[PDB]
Design a protein around this ligand. Structure first.
Ligand SMILES: [Cl-]
Ligand SMILES: [Cl-]
Ligand SMILES: [Cl-]
Ligand SMILES: [Cl-]
Ligand SMILES: [Cl-]
Ligand SMILES: [Cl-]
Ligand SMILES: [Cl-]
Ligand SMILES: [Cl-]
Lengths: 192, 191, 191, 192, 191, 191
């Protein structure tokens, strides 16, 4: 029997035109796909979370696919992943998403090289969290560091977990701090 | 133009269940929001009529996105909301009753129910529950619902966040009787 | 009895101005809230009808307090709200549309406008903007307004917070035209 | 010209019947009266806040009178005072309320002996704050320590201040930790 | 043992100024917090005396950490606080008045002022302003101040967060007169 | 100088367990934060390079405090963060990627892993979860973790809060395999 039971999902698309500076030619879009699932381990200590982590890869694929379909496969430049575990769970129940969300997303995207950044928390329902993103091909590209806030008002309830993926289309709208540029990426190790 | 958009958000919330027997089709509630500069922040402007008039165009934009997102034949509930930044006043949000409501109803081919609403003057990041009801008859009990809106970094003190909401049906475990969609007979927008 | 009250709050908010010319009389918006045990928390109950029926009595209690507080002849706007604790479901709050609305309208001698509403399932301490409109005609534009409600330590997971709101008039700097109280002519509850 | 301009006021009355224990014969009522006023010093450093503090005594009297009229003069057993200053102000703009709110309230109440407890903060509009209360005749009466949350959704705006007084009618609903009792008060110094 | 510690936090806040002429030395306020299991969560326990007794050692632990952090000779203000998880009750935090206060006063060589306090029953992540006053005379007007405490993931429903606060001086721009440190003469803990 | 510090906070969070078998030694995560005036609040400044350069010394200050708090030989995870006040912009926080990261890495003798980060433009009191990872190899799965930061009264609209985080080890009940500290072999800062 599946360990994955979805109560609700949210898709958010934030389009930023400017931040009071000269507007860029095209706006930035950052998008998050979230799913609220029952936590099969809430309220007890389970030493073996490996089966759960394995099955969650399919959830990763589902959410990542939705994001590509939303933004367009050719438009992805930044990503992230995140988890919010309900108060009857533990951090480790969210930590399964590093592999499940990250690997699934990277596979959907043709295996870009940058590690997918992440943030997670154990929190009360409605908790809002800033999710950091970076460039999919080289984590050090300075223009692309950014953030989007995620959260669902009534989730995760104590015995639930909220899993999320984030994708975006470009650089900060007024990026102007130099550093490594897309054109300067030369190692192709996922960093520089 | 009195309308200068900094950012927009589109939210689609799909509910499969709420721990009861899952309905055949999930519910989708969607919100389309725009954060704009408040041209009147920091002073008392006696005439907000031109602003209210022009805002209808923002209503059209947002409503059009919602219909494109959910499908025109799939709309059953709606709402409108405004959050005014702390340097503004409530009246700056009140303009949206007409601007958002009339624009959305026009987009939808003039359904009869008044569009429900909520508004506040608040700090950036304020989150607000937005109530929805049935577009053809406000009293259809199965359809009363809510969705939370908000943007983390908005409205900043001299901004306004305007939003519209559309949805596809009843609460996932609606079971409290009352007037049903099918029983609607007066067509006055209530019953 | 399905109604076990832990605590109640009564809030009266008097607004003198919002940085414009102060009206002759300030506006008062008041909310009366009750936190009760949710008899259905933690399970799916198919029949919420008895609960909805009994809750009318809670509606009467709260509405009566509001009228006693503001004065019966001074009521111009109203609303109703519910916040369900995290172990409950939205349907547990939905019972209040009838229970709170009908009870309040009865207390007020059956004004014609549907009582507006908002609800959520939320954590203890959740705060919610509650929209109000004119009791005799929902379209009276001057009267659309809001008040925030909430109780710091409620609803706890197995509780429900039910609330009613009454107010004494228009927004303090209402100036957006629309249908006025005086122009009300249809008496259908809208116009 | 007056330094006191009120935008809005709130009166809250919280009645507690129980906290899942055996209910007391009469419920506890805790009430807060708040006023949101313009801050005449927002955005600058003013060395002399003494005139403002002096005039604010009248605001203290107004709010304290409202509370007695609400709860009944014969029913008061606990109190407190609090201030929330908008973000363009400073803590000192709230600190004026120790004297202005405290002394005014004590005078309205016939000069009970216990110092009025207090809390204050400089915060964003909508900030919610727990206000602690204690027994008006002897601060150490253990049964009476309690709290009520105050706040106004849209206040204080940056250039405003929210001032508040609190009064209440008795002990915690399930007080059971011994300590100094009302009957044991014998020094009458405001402590014991 | 009735004391099972999940996590602890120590926070030291240094204030150089608040947009006025900076004082000679900055103010430091420090909070030491401990999150523990609530042995009584979910039931009404009439006898909390053994718990209150045992908590004295937790008071001593937190107080000793604060003295070791700021330096015994530098302490001029203090406070105590408790946040109880939502499955508990207020009385579960009330035990800290004696356990925290007496332990801290003992550690500090019995200063005379009553330790001020604030408490709440709240959801995980609740943030609370904690008021401090002068350790030798509660009326010393320059010393009234506050610090915010809270832990993001605590107290969970079956936990309690207990905290102590110490600080090194007056508000950075204290200028409202009243009783001064130097004018203290009663030594009753008030004046 | 473009750096004017109003206040600083140091927080050390000690985790003994998270309801599982407690590890041999607890985890400590520490955050060092500084609230400064935003020299650019309210205007678009095209050249933020001098500010970014000058901020390096603030990075060194905060990093040195963290090493002195936890001990240089005990550091295994780090992060950096910024919260910009509402009158600023995101770019005002973005300067901290280099200023914070490079300063901290220098203090730590140049560990290879990129310092993770998160930033926001927000209202005073905004709380933010900050993610950490292993300082020698970002992929070490046991070490991914987070700590919440924030100051109640900061950043005010014309301020910025800059922060660094260091920690001493893995999650208290890390058990998901993946790359281990011991298996690190590339030394590129990833694996
Ligand atoms: Cl990854
Ligand atoms: Cl409408
Ligand atoms: Cl109704
Ligand atoms: Cl006093
Ligand atoms: Cl005591
Ligand atoms: Cl004490
Ligand atoms: Cl960098
Ligand atoms: Cl770095």
């Amino acid at each position: 029997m599946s360990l994955i039971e979805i109560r609700k999902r949210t898709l958010i698309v934030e389009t930023t035109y400017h931040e009071n500076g000269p507007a860029p030619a095209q706006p930035l879009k950052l998008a998050a796909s979230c799913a609220v699932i029952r936590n099969p381990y809430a309220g007890r200590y389970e030493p073996d979370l490996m089966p759960f982590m394995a099955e969650l890869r399919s959830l990763g694929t589902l959410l990542a696919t939705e994001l590509v379909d939303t933004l367009g496969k050719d438009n992805i430049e930044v990503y992230s992943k995140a988890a919010i575990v309900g108060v009857d769970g533990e951090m480790e129940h969210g930590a399964v998403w590093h592999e499940a969300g990250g690997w699934a997303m990277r596979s959907v995207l043709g295996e870009p090289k940058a590690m997918v950044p992440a943030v997670k928390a154990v929190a009360t329902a409605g908790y809002r969290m800033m999710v950091p993103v970076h460039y999919i091909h080289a984590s050090y590209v300075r223009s692309h560091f950014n953030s989007i806030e995620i959260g669902i008002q009534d989730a995760p309830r104590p015995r639930e977990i909220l899993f999320a993926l984030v994708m975006g289309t470009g650089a900060r709208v007024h990026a102007r701090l130099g550093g490594l540029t897309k054109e300067a990426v030369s190692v192709h190790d996922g960093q520089r």
